Amino acid sequence: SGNAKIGHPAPNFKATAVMPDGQFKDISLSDYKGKYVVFFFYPLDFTFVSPTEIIAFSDRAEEFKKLNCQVIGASVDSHFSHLAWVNTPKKQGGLGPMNIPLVSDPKRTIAQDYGVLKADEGISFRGLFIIDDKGILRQITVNDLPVGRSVDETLRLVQAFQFTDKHG
Amino acid sequence: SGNAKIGHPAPNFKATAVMPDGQFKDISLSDYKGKYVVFFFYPLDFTFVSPTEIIAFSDRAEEFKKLNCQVIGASVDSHFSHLAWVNTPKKQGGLGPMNIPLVSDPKRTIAQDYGVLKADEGISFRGLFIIDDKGILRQITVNDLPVGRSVDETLRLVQAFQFTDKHG
Numbered sequence: 001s002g003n004a005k006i007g008h009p010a011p012n013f014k015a016t017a018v019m020p021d022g023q024f025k026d027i028s029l030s031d032y033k034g035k036y037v038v039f040f041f042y043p044l045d046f047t048f049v050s051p052t053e054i055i056a057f058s059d060r061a062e063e064f065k066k067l068n069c070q071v072i073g074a075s076v077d078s079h080f081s082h083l084a085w086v087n088t089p090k091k092q093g094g095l096g097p098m099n100i101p102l103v104s105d106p107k108r109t110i111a112q113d114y115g116v117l118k119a120d121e122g123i124s125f126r127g128l129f130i131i132d133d134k135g136i137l138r139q140i141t142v143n144d145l146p147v148g149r150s151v152d153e154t155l156r157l158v159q160a161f162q163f164t165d166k167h168g
Numbered sequence: 169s170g171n172a173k174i175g176h177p178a179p180n181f182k183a184t185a186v187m188p189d190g191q192f193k194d195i196s197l198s199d200y201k202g203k204y205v206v207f208f209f210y211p212l213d214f215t216f217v218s219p220t221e222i223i224a225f226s227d228r229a230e231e232f233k234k235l236n237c238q239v240i241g242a243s244v245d246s247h248f249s250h251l252a253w254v255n256t257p258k259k260q261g262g263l264g265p266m267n268i269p270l271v272s273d274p275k276r277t278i279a280q281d282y283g284v285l286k287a288d289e290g291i292s293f294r295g296l297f298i299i300d301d302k303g304i305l306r307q308i309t310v311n312d313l314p315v316g317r318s319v320d321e322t323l324r325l326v327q328a329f330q331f332t333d334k335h336g
């Protein structure tokens with residue numbers, strides 16, 4: 001199940017995203033060749049654990065930019081849903097303005113390609129993938145729904161892969 | 169692809185391990201039902217990223233014991249190779265005495281079952297799996313060969329799954 005394999009090219013995708021400026025744009029994983037990419041899935045918009053994760057990554061996007069690394073979040077919700085959540089203030093339980101793009105995967109094909117579809121519910125597990133500047137998958141993380149991810153740990157991994165990339 | 173699926177029983181195994189007392193014993197994942205298990209693969213013995221991880225999990229095994237959690241390491245090397253590394257003095261790059269068992273997977277079937285065999289080389293990637301006290305797989309972590317895992321992160325995940333098990 002899925003085509004995400006360590007040491008092999010990460011599965012490409014082309015999807016509509018809500019961009020940091022608040023507007024829609026169709027983006028592809030291949031747009032970010034030359035940069036490391038952290039690509040993470042969350043189950044659903046308008047939930048309780050996912051916003052804490054999304055906001056944590058968005059708040060700390062600058063730490064990833066200094067590592068020449070693009071962060072991209074994704075769920076199976078529509079792109080309109082993403083925009084409604086961004087336009088809901090954080091004070092009121094929304095995401096607020098974002099520093100990272102949020103991809104919409106409404107046909108669930110990206111989640112299936114990455115092997116993180118919870119088939120009996122049509123939603124993704126908490127999958128996170130680290131892809132190097134050549135597009136090669138370097139790291140797979142999948143959490144069951146109840147437990148969120150750590151930005152600290154993700155930064156540690158990105159830094160460590162970049163460090164070992166310099167060896168010869 | 170393997171048979172390790174979030175929310176499903178983690179694949180059972182029965183394999184020879186070198187135990188903390190330095191003796192060989194055949195153990196099974198099902199021996200630890202009723203406790204959380206952290207089951208991690210490392211690629212080969214007598215290497216220079218794996219020992220940092222193994223020694224860290226061994227050194228801090230009491231923190232997992234406080235969480236009622238058993239840590240188990242594994243590689244495709246023979247159990248004789250495992251013990252030779254344990255018996256190598258730490259000052260010469262050895263593991264030293266271990267607080268955790270080290271499973272031998274010489275047929276590569278356990279790595280295949282867990283979807284972490286690097287097929288063109290016959291060794292495992294750095295897979296780590298968190299399995300709950302009912303035997304259900306809760307978390308999947310797979311790193312490419314160059315980059316090690318974090319005990320802190322593993323403890324964070326084990327504790328968080330146990331907390332959400334009780335309330336949520």
Ligand SMILES: O=C(/C=C/c1ccc(O)c(O)c1)O[C@H](Cc1ccc(O)c(O)c1)C(=O)O
Pocket residue numbers: 163164165166167210211212213215216217218219291313314
């Ligand atoms: O000993 C090492 C060191 C890996 C490493 C350490 C630093 C680097 O910058 C880098 O590119 C690779 O890895 C081995 C795993 C391994 C086994 C076989 C290989 O052909 C391999 O490339 C790595 C281990 O720790 O078990």
